[PDB]
């Protein structure tokens, strides 16, 4: 059972701006997604202090970067708090509405796209390099879900029958044909060292066949 939802008008507008604006400094997408993963790991770590049973779904707090040239995907995996169905459909988009409008105002005043994270909508920077984004996520209080959008004003949510995850979030970036540099090991290392050097969780860059 696949449900299709329309983005809020403000978010669809932000997504089209990110897709259509000429902006060469695309590499900042990885810093934003890694920062999102770090925040989610901070969250489950905090909650586990007063309820250690919240780590029964996985004690390890880490971030994995997994490129796949065969599928032309870059996957960012974390074992953070994860997102409920309500997060995916309603809550996160509701927060992102004010941050979007503020970010658009700043862009008209002289700001640039790399400052998107200061407005809390850094996830959407994924569409600088991805034609489609799939988000697999599992929160302790809900089932495993798959969120997906190729932009165009709509996204889908379904119950995920893939491999069980334990807890956390997988962001699968289906890269644009001309953005395959972000599948190369030395390019990913360079970006992580430049923008994510002090993340307080182990970041493992997987290597391919
Ligand atoms: C896909 C969308 C827009 C719902 C997301 C916003 C932030 C996400 C994220 O990386 N995490 C949130 C907590 C788990 C890690 S996913
Ligand atoms: C991405 C953004 C900024 C819209 C978020 C809202 C709530 C987030 C979160 O980490 N939690 C969800 C579980 C409680 C803490 S992240």
From Swiss-Prot:
<feature type="binding site">
    <location>
        <position position="78"/>
    </location>
    <ligand>
        <name>ATP</name>
    </ligand>
</feature>
<protein>
    <recommendedName>
        <fullName>Heat shock protein HSP 90-alpha</fullName>
    </recommendedName>
</protein>
<feature type="binding site">
    <location>
        <position position="97"/>
    </location>
    <ligand>
        <name>ATP</name>
    </ligand>
</feature>
<feature type="modified residue" description="N6-acetyllysine">
    <location>
        <position position="43"/>
    </location>
</feature>
<feature type="modified residue" description="N6-acetyllysine">
    <location>
        <position position="69"/>
    </location>
</feature>
<feature type="binding site">
    <location>
        <position position="123"/>
    </location>
    <ligand>
        <name>ATP</name>
    </ligand>
</feature>
<comment type="function">
    <text>Molecular chaperone that promotes the maturation, structural maintenance and proper regulation of specific target proteins involved for instance in cell cycle control and signal transduction. Undergoes a functional cycle that is linked to its ATPase activity which is essential for its chaperone activity. This cycle probably induces conformational changes in the client proteins, thereby causing their activation. Interacts dynamically with various co-chaperones that modulate its substrate recognition, ATPase cycle and chaperone function.</text>
</comment>
<feature type="binding site">
    <location>
        <position position="36"/>
    </location>
    <ligand>
        <name>ATP</name>
    </ligand>
</feature>
<comment type="function">
    <text>(Microbial infection) Seems to interfere with N.meningitidis NadA-mediated invasion of human cells. Decreasing HSP90 levels increases adhesion and entry of E.coli expressing NadA into human Chang cells; increasing its levels leads to decreased adhesion and invasion.</text>
</comment>
<comment type="similarity">
    <text>Belongs to the heat shock protein 90 family.</text>
</comment>
<comment type="subunit">
    <text>(Microbial infection) Interacts with herpes simplex virus 1 protein US11; this interaction inhibits TBK1-induced interferon production.</text>
</comment>
<feature type="region of interest" description="Interaction with NR3C1">
    <location>
        <begin position="1"/>
        <end position="209"/>
    </location>
</feature>
<comment type="subunit">
    <text>Homodimer. Identified in NR3C1/GCR steroid receptor-chaperone complexes formed at least by NR3C1, HSP90AA1 and a variety of proteins containing TPR repeats such as FKBP4, FKBP5, PPID, PPP5C or STIP1. Forms a complex containing HSP90AA1, TSC1 and TSC2; TSC1 is required to recruit TCS2 to the complex. The closed form interacts (via the middle domain and TPR repeat-binding motif) with co-chaperone TSC1 (via C-terminus). Interacts with TOM34. Interacts with TERT; the interaction, together with PTGES3, is required for correct assembly and stabilization of the TERT holoenzyme complex.</text>
</comment>
């Amino acid at each position: 059972e696949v449900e299709t939802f329309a983005f809020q008008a403000e978010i669809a507008q932000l997504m089209s701006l990110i897709i259509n604006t000429f902006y060469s400094n695309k590499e900042i997408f990885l810093r934003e997604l890694i920062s999102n993963s770090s925040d989610a790991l901070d969250k489950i770590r905090y909650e586990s202090l007063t309820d250690p049973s919240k780590l029964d779904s996985g004690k390890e707090l880490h971030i994995n970067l997994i490129p796949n040239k065969q599928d032309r995907t870059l996957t960012i995996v974390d074992t953070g708090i994860g997102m409920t169905k309500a997060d995916l459909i309603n809550n996160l988009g509701t927060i992102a509405k004010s941050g979007t409008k503020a970010f658009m105002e700043a862009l008209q005043a002289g700001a640039d796209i790399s400052m998107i994270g200061q407005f809390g909508v850094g996830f959407y920077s994924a569409y600088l390099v991805a034609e489609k984004v799939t988000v697999i996520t599992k929160h302790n209080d809900d089932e495993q879900y798959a969120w997906e959008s190729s932009a165009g004003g709509s996204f889908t949510v379904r119950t995920d029958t893939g491999e069980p995850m334990g807890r956390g979030t997988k962001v699968i970036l289906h890269l644009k044909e001309d953005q395959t540099e972000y599948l190369e090991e030395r390019r990913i290392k360079e970006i992580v060292k430049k923008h994510s050097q002090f993340i307080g969780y182990p970041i493992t860059l997987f290597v391919e066949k």
